[PDB]
Structure formats: structure tokens, C-alpha cells
């Protein structure tokens, strides 16, 4: 594949997609045992390890809806995978949605025209596998870990309307990659789903602090890990 | 409200949404306790009755996102319902989707353009109250109902010479109706709590037809998770 | 055909379309001579009677353009239909149109999208069969019966934005069927025509009284009738 | 105006559009009396005389909807004109519009951007003066000169490799030409009354050409039934 | 071709397209040597003559997409023009753009539907021929002539919205022709510019004079012919 | 700025662009004097450098129009840059597109929503700032590096079975790349420069690949114009 310079069976069935590739080497080293990068290639790192037994490739995406695309396109069609999860954080957009949350994504709206390219007049809807998030659901629900399950918004510019009104419709918070993943995953009959931590509030400019993000990164992983094995 | 001729009362809280009036009656009159019918206006029937210490409401909704959509409305604004599940079919468009499968809609792509009359460049993706959804997926496991939860397509055109079902099957989508995307949309609007449980009444890609038996069957088992799901 | 339980050749060839069922018994039960009900499926009350020796359908269609697509494409495809009739009510959008005008639409706007699902980037206006207009314009003429020929908006949405912008571009009201009509049945090669009264000014928030109904119902029942007979 | 170059009382109530301004100099000299040319700015001439008692103006108005939005606008606008008749040919899209038939233009489809300009989310139906209308009609029929009565497309691109004037002749459309939409929108929208009368010049899906003798008749046809119309 | 009266070989390999076929005769009369005129259908005038040696001609193309598309697509396919150079003005919407400055197209936004209408989901940006657009350039710069080289908007309503907006984004100036003709070239292998002058500003409402007027369409003829020759 | 760890006047007036932060890591090392690395932030490298005389930055920009924007809007709005070059590579999508053409980009066709978004009914056409090519194409021509002048296809989906680039090709577009509609338009947004110089990496509509070694010398090239250009 022309962005992964992985060999056959470096890559395992599952693989979680953090957007950072630096995120993607911090979860490999802390959580996972017999580590191998198998991919440096535009220093969007890949690597391969083992948790409890099953193994596990953690593959950085990069942002946005083409970004991520080209490694889900390439993750599938040229090295098999079947589970893709993404672990991730999203700005919430409701005050309902607390700091401490791990949201499920169900699905995720856009503006992204990705979509509107291939299906013209229809507005797609992009699915999670209900089974990864029910045994993510499960594994949360199972240590109380706090989760909430929604909508996202996929956004393709960084840098507001809307995301006012998309709060008003009950969408929990904006990220840049849900819809890519979940489009992509189905058109191949692979699995997929997102799982966001709260990096901010948005509307609010409330911030969340180092400590309380680094204990949702922890809550996020552990249950991307739990879910699986 | 100008569609529903009931008094302030007579609907409960949580609302069964058929598409078809006569199916409302039937469901009503089978399964519920001491029913009233609420609604005679346009012979788009409502009924309320009791299931299990709960009070019910069976609206027909008629059929097509408009239709479905002054109804929800005026249930929410005028009769401040909090849970409404649609109980209804769908056209299979997978040969993977089976007879007997009762769906449990997460989310519903459309070819109707109310959504993007509100949003404009956003594709909107209307979403079920998990809690809702989680319950009646509970209540089948529960009781063994086979169960598959996924998305469907709501289509505004029940014959449709320009059909892309054969290409938002590939995506996975599981069947054809013309109801749930307003459902959702509109009940999240208001930060109400909406889910479509579906049965298969045929595969569209193949033609092929379900038998009277198996749709009874079917049919029972989705008023069945419907109601044990609310309680 | 699957919504219509009618035998072979118990529906007319000219169909009156009003929306509510029970209006489709009252026109036949009023209008009509030996009737018979050959549809009660979904209870959207189908009925064949004549007038003046001509047999005559009416035909419930239930709210909105899938609504009415449903019953339309039936109709055509399944029993033969050469004439259809929309008798409905609308909501007028202009002061110049008064409680008691009978209103031919020539054409029809729309928000539905089932047009742009057809034709993309192409706006199609729909056009009312000029034959069957100018026979009910010369039935109300004749009368001297109050008679307004413009267009219509066809809206998706029942519960307001461009109904203001509409309105100066001098359509007439406001209904939520005649688009479906209209391009279904020229795309058959069959006759159509709505026929509308006023049931209020949306802008103004003018109701009518329910005599001024009851009348403007009557002239346009008989002129619908006078004109294929 | 900008386009037009007549001092106020110039151009008369009442005023044919011809596309091609060699056209209306035609029709000003030969059906009217008492001719002055009131514009010669871009060569888009405009004409001005007497037919049976009333003052006529007939101006060109150039090709496509911006051109004649031009001319429409500053008729409207800067001379206070209130009935606007279109005087021109379309291609026949369909067989069984006949080559002798004056086509009068209920409404049109586009694929003009205009109306999406304005309205988004709504596909605006441009929509002609009934009375103007039904006036052409009679005055058709009291000398038995062959008309349909239907709509038209008013097309972007002359020359189009996407063209789906196939399928718009599915739907029964007419005929394609390039001013309709425009005139018809406008005018309405400045409360003004509008017509499109129009003859056949060929048939674009069969290729087949009409004579020049017999495009002098149904010129004859269309002009006689224009003016006839508005006495 | 349908709309253009010419013979054989009575059309140059390269035209000068003013909107008005008044000035292309005063063009043609006041530039050329032995001028013909090829072309008196719907009186928009085509002539012919030579500047410097170099067959010439000048064809009027009307106002709006539609109109120049006609003409263009018929000198294209029916004389096998290779060069087409509009000769025309623009309001200009930004103050930095002056009212002597003769402008060199690149590409040109439009509202004109007639790009979406073949591509779809795409935007379709129109591109001056490199080699036409420097050697103009080059010609400007060698007299001193002021020239500004940028974006046009294309529009197809004459009597605002956004103007506002594409100025903001450095949009010099609005016309109504460019972006069809920059289209139609390039889908037929040909070679297209658009050179213009400023005949106001439209956000200020501020009018050129007609000695300035004069000035800068003699500095835009002159450059169109030099470059070419 | 939130994706950018640089301090105040770490960043020069002048930024070149490659999408791989390894290339821009290669171009800073191997073309420029006393180089720091300023952002590590997801390890999207940048650098700044000197090259005779001037301040030159070499920024990372990843894949895609969001990746890019991001990065754009904190040079511009954080970092005051001025003069924003992508240095990249393109598929050719015409067989006259030659592997050793330096392409410069005059404007950029798009399937990105970005615009749609923000112009509704406008196609907006972006634009590379006359100067900056202008200074690009004299520089390749004092040396003799072949170069091409023209547009490309800024893609939204790199692996696309409903691609239109068949279309694009016969139209005259040069080649598809993701990045150059997103920095022409933020650029010319803020009043900055921008241009975007390409090498081909191979003809996507023949499937022909080109040599590590011709991959080399038009990379070359391509960076000698870039950094002549703004000297
Ligand atoms: N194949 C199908 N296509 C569309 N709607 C269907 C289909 N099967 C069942 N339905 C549902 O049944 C109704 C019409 O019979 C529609 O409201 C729709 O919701
Ligand atoms: N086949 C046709 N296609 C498009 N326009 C036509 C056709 N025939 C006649 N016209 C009319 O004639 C003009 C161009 O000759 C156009 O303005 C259009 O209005
Ligand atoms: N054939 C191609 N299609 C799309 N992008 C390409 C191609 N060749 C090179 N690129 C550029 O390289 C990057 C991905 O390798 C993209 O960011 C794109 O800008």
C-alpha cells in the first residue's frame, strides 16, 4: 500500500486509529508488549503488539476526512483488517456532555462532501457496528466507566455555524474523522467505531485540564482494549 | 393541534407510531387494556390503553416523511409526548437481511430534502435515543427474538425508477422505508426519545415475497419487544 | 396494487383526489349515485359512483408527496387512470386571494426534492393538463363561479421561511400534494389537474368560518364534476 | 437605463420580445404604423408603433436568461412596462409536437441557476399571466390557428453534451429555448403580466429540419395570435 | 453554424470576442485593413481584416454565459478558431483595483450553473491559456501599461450578494462572459484569454469617466493585438 | 496556535509547504543553512533555515484540505506569514503531462465542500497570486527547467470509484493532487501570496509509474524554482 510500508502480516485484525502518530507510539509503548513499528512512511507511525494475547496494531490517521480515508482505504483493501476503532478527542457542544464522558459515536453528520459525491441527492447516514459499540458500551458499563452514546459531527474545516444548530438536534460534539471511518468500513463489510474523549467545550471556550484528560485518554483505551479481548 | 382531535390527557407519554391507522386498532385492540380511540380525524386513528400499569398510545402516522412528520409535531408541541417508536416494515435490500430479523434502527439515510432545507451544506445524521434502542434490544435478547441493528433508507418515492438502493446496499444499509428519518430528527429537535423497530415484509432486489404466516410471526415479536421495552 | 384492493375495473377513468379519506366518503356519498367502496386498505377510502351517467372515482391520498406518489403511481400503472383531480384545501399566501376564490394551479413550487432526485441540476416545473384547466375554468365561468388561475407551492413541511419570498413572487398558496400529481402524471402521459380552496391566510393567520368552507367546498366539487361532464 | 437609450414615453405598455433584434425591426415595420426606433445601444434595437389603436413596442433581447434579464429588468424598472409577450421558436423535443402548432407557455423548466440563486431549497415554477394567456388562447382558436398549450425548457447551453432533454420529453415537455424562465420569473416578481409564445423551428431529437416557407407561416401565426391577444 | 453567416475560410485562426457588436465594428474599422464583415445574423456582427499581417477577426458575442457559448462553440467547431480573446470590461470591487488598469484574467468564479450542470459535486475552476495571458502580460509591460492580473467573477444576474464576499477574497472585478469562454477553449484544446477594463467601481458606485473610458479600451485593444502578433 | 509549538519569530515571512513532514525535514537539511526544528506538535515537522540571505521555513502540512487549512490558518493568523508555497507532487491525468514538467498552478478545480460551504450557488475558483508564479516561472525559465502552466484537480477522496478525472483530463486539468484549493483560498482569505509547484509521480489514467531516479531530479527542480523564486 503506498502510504504504509508495511510487509504481509505485520498488521493486525485490529487496529486502533488515533489521529496523532505521536498518540499512536504513546499507546502502542504503554499498553501493549512486543512492540514493532511497522511503518514510518511520512512519519505516520504503525505499530504492531499484543494485548492479553490478542494482537493489536495502533496506526496514526492524520486530520480530517481525507487524511484518515487514505489509511482506512489501505488498511482494508491491502492488509485485511476487519475491527477499526478510533480513539480519539472531539470539542463537545453540549453542556450536558461532561469532561469525564467517553462517547460512542452511532453515527456522525458532515459537511464533509464525501459522501454527496457518491450519493448525489442522498444524505447518507454512516453506522457504527452495533456489535464493537455494544461490547464497548459493555465494557465501560461493566468497570462504571462513564459513557455517553450520540451523534458527532465530522467536520472539514477547523475554523462555527451550525455547530449550533447541530446541538440544538441533540449532536453531542465536532471531531474531524468519525464520518470518513464509518463510511469507509461499511462500503468494505468491516467494522468500525469511534471513541471520543472531551477536549473542550466549544460554545463555552471551557477548556478541560491536563489531568482530566489524561485520565479520560486512560478510560478511552482501556475500553477500545477491553472491548476486543 | 389541527390533526389530532384529542383533549388534553387522553395520550400517553410513550407512543407506539404505526404507519397504517387500521394496523394502530389492531395493535391497540390486541394487546392493550381498556382502549379508547382519542383520534378520528381524517380516519388517521389514535387509540390509548393500558400495558402492565403503563398508559400506551397507538398513533397512525400514514405514510411519507410529511405525513409522519405533522404528526410527531403535533404529538410533541401539543400533547408533550416524551417516547415514540415507530412499529414498522421495511423492503429488505440485503440478502443477508433475513425474513425473520426484526430491526432496530441506529441511524436512517434519505433521499427526503427536509434536512438539508435546515441544514444546507451539513449532511444530517438523525440518530435513535440509545437508551430507547438498548431496551428494546435487551427485550429481545430477553426473549430470544432474532434482532439486527443497523440503518435503513427513508425514501420519499415508494416506486422509484432512480433508485440508488442497489448502491446504499453495498454500504451496508439494510432496508427501504419512508418514515424514520423525520422520526428521529424531529423528536431530537425537541430532546425527545424516538427509535424505529422494523420487520421485513420483502426483499426489493430480489422480488421475492414473505408469506402472510411469517409476517404474522414477525409482527408479534416487534409489538412484543416494543412493549416490554417501555415496560 | 399493493395500497389499492380494487378488482379490475372497479375504479373510474377520471379519479377525484381529495387528501382526507373521509372527505373521498362524504364527495362520493353526496355526489354520487349507486357508490361502492372498492378500497379500505390502510382505511384510505377509495369509492366508484356516477354523475350524470359518467363513472367517477374518488380516492383518498393521505398528506404529502410520497403520500399521494403512492396512490398516483397506482392509479396510473395498475388501473388504467386517464384523468386525476386533486380537490384539496391550501393555505392562500397573498391578501388578493380571497375566502372564496376556487383556485386552478397551472403550475406548482416545491421544497420536495423528488424532482431534483430525477433531474439533478435541471428545475422542473410541473404543469397542470391545459385541457382539463380550461374545462374547469369555463365550468366555473359559466356559473359565474369565483375562479383564480396561478400557482401553488407544494411544501414538505407543514410547521415558514420563502412562504414570504414565494408570496411576492405571486404564488397563491400554500398545499402540500400537487408537485406529486402533476409530474407523475405527465410522466404516464395521463390528464391532471388540482383544484383548490382556501382553508386560511397563513401570513396574516386569517382563518376562514367554516359556512364560508362549506360553500367554497361545493363550488369546487361541482365544478371538478361539471367540467368532466 | 443602461441598455436601453429611450427618454421616458418612448416605449409603450405593451411590448413583444423577439430574441433577435433584425427580428423586431421585422415585426415593427412590417405589422405596425407609425415606427420609430427608440434604441440602438448594442444594436439591440427596440421599435416603437400603432396596431389597432394601441401603442406597441417590440425589443430584442439578445440570447440566454442573463440577456434577456437585462432587457426585462430595465423595461420593468426604468419604463414602467406592463405586459411582456416573448415572440420566438423553440426545438420540438417530442414527436407529436407538430411543426404548424404556436406553443404557448404555461410554464418552464431550467437549468439556469437563477431561481436556485434565490430560492436554495426550492425548485421555483415560473408561471405565465393567466389572462395574457387565455387572451392568446381565444385569439388563436377565433382564427382556428393550431396551438398546444404546455411547457417549455429554458436551457444554459445551446449546445449541451449533458442535455437530458430526453427525459424532459418523457414528461411531456414541449419544447427548449433560452428566455422563458427568465421572463417569467421577473415579471412576476415586479407584478407584471407575461406570456412566451412560441413556434417550432425543429425537431432537436430526430434532427429533422422545418422548411423556410413553412417557418413564414407559423411566424405569420404567432404574431397574428401576439397582437390579436392584447387588441 | 446555425448562428454565424460565414463562408469557408472567411474567419481568422484568431478573434477578438467584444460583448458588443457595435464595438466590434468600431474594433474592426479602427484597428484593421481590409475589413470584411462575415457575419450579419441577429446583427451581431463578425468582421475581418489584418493587423500588421495577421488575419484578424472580431466577433460580437452578446451578454451572458449562454450567449458567448454560442458563438464560441460555433467559431470552435464550424472554423476551427484557435485563439479566442474577449476584449471587454468589468466593474471592478475592490478599491486597489484603478480605473486605468488593464486586467488579465487567470480564472473567473461564476454563478452560472452551466459547470455544475456537467460536473456535478465538482467546482469546475476555468484557466486562462499560460501562453496568451504572459504574452499579453509581456506586451503590457514592454509600453508600461498598467496591468493587473487576477480572478473575475462570471455572473449571470446584472442587477450584489457575496460581490461583497468574493472581493474579500481579492476578486478583482465582475463581468458576465469568462468563465464560459475559458471552459468552452479549454474542452475543445483551444486557446482562450479575457482581457478587461474597468468601466466602475460597484461598491462605491463610483463611475470611470469617458476620456478614461477611451484611454484604457485603446491600452486593451492595443495589448490584445500586440500580444498576438 | 494549537498544532503549531513555535514561539514568536521562529517562523519566517516565507513557507514552503510539502505535505510530508519528512520531505520538509529533507528539503531544510539538504537546501538550507543553520536549520532548527520549531514543531514537533503531532510530529508534523517545521523548520526554519536560511537560503542566501532570507529566512525560509519548511512546514509539514499532511494530506488533504482540512490537514492543510489547519496549518494555513496558524501560519497566516498566528505566525503573520506572508508567502505560502505548497511543494508537492501530483498524478498526471493527461498523456501530454510529461514526468519531467514542473507544474505551476494557476487554480485549482475542487470536490471539496470548503467553498460550497462558504459561497453557496457560487463556484468559487481559487487563485495562485500572479507574482509568486510569475517569479516561479522566470526562475525555471533562467535555468531551464521545464514547466508547465495550468490548473489541477484538488481531490477529497485519493482512492475515489466515482472519479471524475476522466472528465477533468478532457476539459485540459493537469493532474490531481489534495492540497491546492485549500491554500489558495485561505491565503487570498487573509491577503497573502500563495502558489502551489508540482512534479508528476505518475499517470493515474495509464496506471504508469515513474522511476525513483526521475522522482529525484524533478524534486530537485522543483525546489531550485521554489527558493530562486523568492531568492
Ligand atoms: N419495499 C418498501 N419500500 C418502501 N416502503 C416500504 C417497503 N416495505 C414496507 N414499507 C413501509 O410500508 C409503507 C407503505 O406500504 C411505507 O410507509 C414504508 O414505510
Ligand atoms: N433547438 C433549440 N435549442 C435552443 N434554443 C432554440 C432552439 N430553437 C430555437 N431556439 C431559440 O432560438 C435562439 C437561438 O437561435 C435561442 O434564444 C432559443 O431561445
Ligand atoms: N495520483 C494522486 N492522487 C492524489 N494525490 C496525489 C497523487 N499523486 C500525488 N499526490 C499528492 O500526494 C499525497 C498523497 O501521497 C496527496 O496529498 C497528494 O497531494
Redesign the interface.
Same mark, same amino acid.
Do not use: H
Given at each position: 500500500s503506498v502510504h504504509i510500508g508495511a510487509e504481509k502480516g505485520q498488521i493486525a485484525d485490529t487496529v486502533l486509529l488515533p &489521529? @496523532?502518530?505521536?498518540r499512536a507510539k504513546f499507546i502502542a509503548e504503554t499498553y501493549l508488549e512486543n512492540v514493532e513499528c511497522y511503518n514510518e512512511v !511520512? &512519519? /505516520?507511525?504503525g505499530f504492531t503488539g499484543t494485548y492479553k494475547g490478542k494482537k493489536i496494531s495502533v496506526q &496514526?490517521t %492524520?486530520? %480530517? $476526512?481525507?487524511?484518515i480515508?487514505?489509511y482506512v482505504?489501505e488498511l482494508i483493501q491491502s492488509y485485511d483488517v476487519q475491527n477499526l476503532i478510533r480513539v480519539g478527542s472531539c470539542g463537545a457542544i453540549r453542556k450536558d456532555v461532561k469532561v469525564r464522558d467517553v462517547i460512542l459515536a452511532?453515527?456522525? *453528520?458532515? @459537511?464533509?462532501?464525501?459522501? !454527496?459525491?457518491? +450519493?448525489?441527492? $442522498? @444524505?447518507?447516514?454512516?453506522?457504527?457496528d +452495533?456489535e464493537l459499540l #455494544?461490547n464497548a458500551?459493555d465494557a465501560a458499563k461493566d468497570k462504571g466507566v462513564p459513557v455517553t $452514546? %450520540? *451523534?458527532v459531527?465530522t467536520? @472539514?474545516?477547523?475554523?462555527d455555524s451550525?455547530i449550533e444548530?447541530?446541538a #440544538?438536534? %441533540?449532536v453531542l460534539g465536532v471531531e /474531524?474523522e468519525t464520518?470518513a471511518l464509518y463510511?469507509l468500513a461499511?462500503?468494505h463489510?468491516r467494522k468500525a467505531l469511534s471513541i471520543l474523549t472531551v477536549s473542550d467545550h466549544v460554545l463555552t471556550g471551557e477548556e478541560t485540564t491536563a489531568e482530566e484528560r489524561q485520565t479520560t485518554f486512560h478510560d478511552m483505551i482501556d475500553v477500545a482494549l477491553h472491548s476486543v479481548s
Open positions: &489521529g @496523532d502518530p505521536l !511520512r &512519519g /505516520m507511525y &496514526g %492524520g486530520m %480530517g $476526512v481525507p487524511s480515508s487514505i482505504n452511532m453515527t456522525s *453528520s458532515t @459537511d464533509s462532501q464525501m459522501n !454527496r459525491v457518491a +450519493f448525489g441527492s $442522498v @444524505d447518507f447516514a454512516p453506522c457504527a +452495533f #455494544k458500551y $452514546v %450520540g *451523534s459531527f467536520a @472539514d474545516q477547523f475554523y451550525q444548530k447541530l #440544538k438536534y %441533540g /474531524m464520518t463510511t461499511a462500503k463489510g
